[PDB]
Design a protein around this ligand. Structure first.
Ligand SMILES: Cc1cc2nc3c(=O)[nH]c(=O)nc-3n(C[C@H](O)[C@H](O)[C@H](O)COP(=O)(O)OP(=O)(O)OC[C@H]3O[C@@H](n4cnc5c(N)ncnc54)[C@H](O)[C@@H]3O)c2cc1C
Lengths: 666, 133, 16
């Protein structure tokens, strides 16, 4: 899209309508006359445009109103409310801009941010930008969280986030104009290679893929038209519903085979009953011929009855010879109706062992995408966020993604090697208790008006807790934590001295032998400028290979690559790295998924702040104190970096509205 | 509204495979048995029919008789009149078969005999004696 | 979720 309407689209906003968030700050306008809405919407889209066209420098209200024209520049408070809503909620002046009016000299309010993943960093930058004292507590000795980036010599390779999923409407677009990121498009072509080491032939490839996507439509139709969402009091997972669909596709291969052969029997038995009428005229004729012959043995002259006997047996015998001739016709039809049906046999199988194993690779792809076995995914809801997909090519960050968290960390009080242990929030403030990860003994105490928690969902899930909430989190929050899924996927990075692969396909599949291994080393990535190949361990495999050495793992890697490229075209890798995200105690997993039994609404539960009870009984209701951000908190963009970043911006605007007040609602 | 084309997801079909654990593999092994039991039934009647098919070796062929071609004459020789009364006693009102027995007379010329010689050749009592039968 | 998919992006069940 283009113009001011493109700025609304690149801010994930409808250009022609007011969002629920805007109705909240501008209820005057949304209940007001359509013309003011159109005015409002224009200042909205125009200011977004202004910011978007130059995201490297702060967009002051002065600069905004300066470039507004009548009729719109005629109301300066509307333009001030709009610009301040936009700025408060991270739609403008987010990220890494040159601040025009340098930072307020003295700060207001103190925020503790747990974790410096991208969500934490995104809030900290906004909160500080808003004049608050923000400091971040980070258990690792680095920022980024699950944006991990291997670097050695000229080798770079992301073991966490790795792909910008398209720039259309993507906040990572703005960040990339603000930050050197080598964004390289990722080319669609992905050839699959069976366990033998040899291409799936275009023929199969395109049948299996299409049958896969038809199976997905089916599960969707099962869920949404047939309401097939509980079975034996448990919620149907996607993996289950795919089985029920395949089995009904196998029941139907047989159902149709059974009716086709039941058509051969219906005709092999009309032919039976007819070859019986015909065996019974060839003998009613065998004897009328005897009789006619004997009647002809009488030599003339014959009395008239003996003449009639010859004549009558003759008329009789040709009548039956018409009959037996009229049946060898009808015998000639049914005899051909049969290798009509015998020559058009219905489908023999639904899918062969070779088909299923390719259909497995598409399931390993859904298991990668959700970082979990399909048996855990919600059937109804696993893809509940598809409407929000960005447009455009996916991209890779050729200089390593870590380059982004690092850039975002610039300018910020970050305490590395500080492991939060207890979060204590009360009606009057919060204290966060943390230890130093090197010598646990060193104990730290941070007091603050509010804590922004960006702990990974897998951390929040630990039994027994890595982090104690005092007072404990209310049930509604802990249930959302226990309902929601936190998946797992891992990465094997292979560093060679030579490019032994197709240097112009970015990615290629490997088809696994068993269903049980469908995830193991199923996809390879050629993304980087040095000879680096990157392999994925998805599905149930991910959980398994964590208990297997690097060597056994890089072994199975080189095996695949040998089998696929030539035992001898595949050198030894000069460096190898295997991720283990479920074992990483600051992740405890990779990213979240809509578990069977969960919905996208659990994501919203996760983002609701906590309000502590009153200290003094009978005292007015507090202020909320415990805020949550992070990938697992953003329903419309889960499991991603951009979703994490967006959730940081969300909380920063929500905290600041709380503790700095929202002057832009009147 | 409808499934993808070719997927067979009736309402009824789904519970039949979900009603218990192996209700899937049960109903599909039911069908595998129904397939063999109809397959050998085919081969059974393919073999039965192959035996009847052999019994008809030769067709009629040794038992056919060549065509009497004679122009359908107008006048009734005493012989043909008597050929007729026997054909009527035998065939009742099959003016056709009567016409092939008496060879030289059209299926009409038959009809016209019935009424012309009605008195003389007692065709009522031939026709009623024909129905006893 | 499905939005994560780069290689061989699935399509069934997705609104076209
Ligand atoms: C293998 C893998 C590949 C991925 N690929 C992609 C991709 O291609 N594209 C994409 O868009 N997304 C991708 N993601 C997802 C993306 O990395 C995450 O969604 C996002 O980075 C998470 O950010 P966050 O700020 O919510 O949490 P995190 O980045 O995990 O940040 C949480 C922080 O909390 C810290 N912490 C944990 N426990 C404590 C504690 N007790 N005290 C203090 N600090 C603590 C952690 O060290 C961490 O720094 C991938 C994820 C994985 C695992």
């Amino acid at each position: 899209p283009s113009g001011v309407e493109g700025a609304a689209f690149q801010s994930r906003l409808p250009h022609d309508r007011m969002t629920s968030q805007e109705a909240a700050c501008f209820p005057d306008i949304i209940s007001g006359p359509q013309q003011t809405q159109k005015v409002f919407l224009f200042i909205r889209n125009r200011t977004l445009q202004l910011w978007l066209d130059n995201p490297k420098i702060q967009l002051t209200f002065e600069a905004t109103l300066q470039q507004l024209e009548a009729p719109y520049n005629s109301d300066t408070v509307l333009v001030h409310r709009v610009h301040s809503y936009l700025e408060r909620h991270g739609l403008i002046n987010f990220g890494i801009y040159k601040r025009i009016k340098p930072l307020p000299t003295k700060k207001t309010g103190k925020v503790i941010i747990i974790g410096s993943g991208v969500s934490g960093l995104a809030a900290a930058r906004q909160l500080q930008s808003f004049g608050m004292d923000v400091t971040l507590l980070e258990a690792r000795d680095r920022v980024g969280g699950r944006v991990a980036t291997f670097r050695k010599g000229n080798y770079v390779a992301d073991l966490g986030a790795m792909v910008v999923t398209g720039l259309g409407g993507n906040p990572m677009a703005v960040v990339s104009k603000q930050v050197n990121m080598e964004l390289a498009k990722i080319k669609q072509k992905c050839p699959l290679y069976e366990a033998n080491g040899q291409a799936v032939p275009k023929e199969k490839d395109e049948m299996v893929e299409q049958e896969f996507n038809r199976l997905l439509e089916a599960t969707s139709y099962l869920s949404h038209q047939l309401d097939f969402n509980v079975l034996n009091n448990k919620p149907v997972s996607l993996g289950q519903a795919l089985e029920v669909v395949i089995q009904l596709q196998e029941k139907h291969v047989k159902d149709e085979q059974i009716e086709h052969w039941k058509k051969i029997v219906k005709t092999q038995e009309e032919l039976k009953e007819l070859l019986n009428k015909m065996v019974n005229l060839k003998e009613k004729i065998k004897e009328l011929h005897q009789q006619y012959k004997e009647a002809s043995e009488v030599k003339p002259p014959r009395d008239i009855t003996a003449e009639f006997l010859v004549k009558s047996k003759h008329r009789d015998l040709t009548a039956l010879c018409k009959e037996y001739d009229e049946l060898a016709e009808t015998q000639g039809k049914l005899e051909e109706k049969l290798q009509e049906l015998e020559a058009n046999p219905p489908s023999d199988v639904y899918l062969s062992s070779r088909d299923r194993q390719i259909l497995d690779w598409h399931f390993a792809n859904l298991e990668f995408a959700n970082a979990t076995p399909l048996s855990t995914l919600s059937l109804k809801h696993w893809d509940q966020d598809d409407d929000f997909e960005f447009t455009g090519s996916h991209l890779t960050v050729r200089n390593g993604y870590s380059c982004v968290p690092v850039a975002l960390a610039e300018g910020l009080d970050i305490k590395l090697n500080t492991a939060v242990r207890q979060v204590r929030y009360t009606a009057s403030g919060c204290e966060v208790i943390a230890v130093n990860t090197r010598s646990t003994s060193q104990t730290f105490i941070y007091k603050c008006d509010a804590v922004l928690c960006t702990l990974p969902l897998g951390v929040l899930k630990q039994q027994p807790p890595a982090v104690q909430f005092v007072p404990p989190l209310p049930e509604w929050k802990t249930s959302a934590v226990q309902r929601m899924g936190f998946g797992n996927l891992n990465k094997v990075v292979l560093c060679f001295d030579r490019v032994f692969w197709d240097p112009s396909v970015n990615l290629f599949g490997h088809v696994g032998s068993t269903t049980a291994s469908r995830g193991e080393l199923f996809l390879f990535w050629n993304l980087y400028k040095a000879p680096i190949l990157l392999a994925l361990v998805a599905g149930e495999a991910a959980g398994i290979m964590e208990n297997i050495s690097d060597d056994v793992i890089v072994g199975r890697c080189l095996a695949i690559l040998k089998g696929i490229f030539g035992s001898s075209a595949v050198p030894q890798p000069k460096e190898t790295v295997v991720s283990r995200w479920r074992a990483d105690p600051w992740a405890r997993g990779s990213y979240s998924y809509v578990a069977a039994g969960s919905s996208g609404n659990d994501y919203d539960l996760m983002a609701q702040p906590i309000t502590p009870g009153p200290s003094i009984p009978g005292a007015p209701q507090p202020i909320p104190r415990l805020f949550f951000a992070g990938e697992h908190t953003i329903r419309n963009y889960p499991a991603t970096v951009h979703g994490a970043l967006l959730s940081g911006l969300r909380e920063a605007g929500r905290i600041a509205d709380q503790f700095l007040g929202a002057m832009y609602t009147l | 509204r409808k499934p993808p084309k070719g997927m067979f997801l009736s309402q009824e079909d789904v519970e039949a495979v979900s009603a218990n654990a192996t209700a899937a593999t049960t109903v599909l092994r039911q069908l595998d048995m129904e397939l063999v039991s109809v397959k050998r039934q085919i081969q059974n009647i393919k073999q039965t029919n192959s035996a009847l098919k052999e019994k008809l070796d030769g067709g009629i062929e040794p038992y056919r008789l060549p065509e009497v071609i004679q122009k359908c004459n107008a006048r009734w020789t005493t012989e043909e009149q008597l050929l007729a009364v026997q054909a009527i006693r035998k065939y009742g009102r099959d003016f056709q078969a009567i016409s092939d027995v008496i060879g030289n007379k059209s299926v009409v010329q038959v009809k016209n005999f019935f009424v012309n010689y009605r008195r003389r050749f007692n065709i009522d009592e031939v026709l009623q004696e024909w129905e006893a039968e | 979720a499905r939005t994560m998919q780069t290689a061989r992006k699935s399509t069934g069940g997705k609104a076209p």
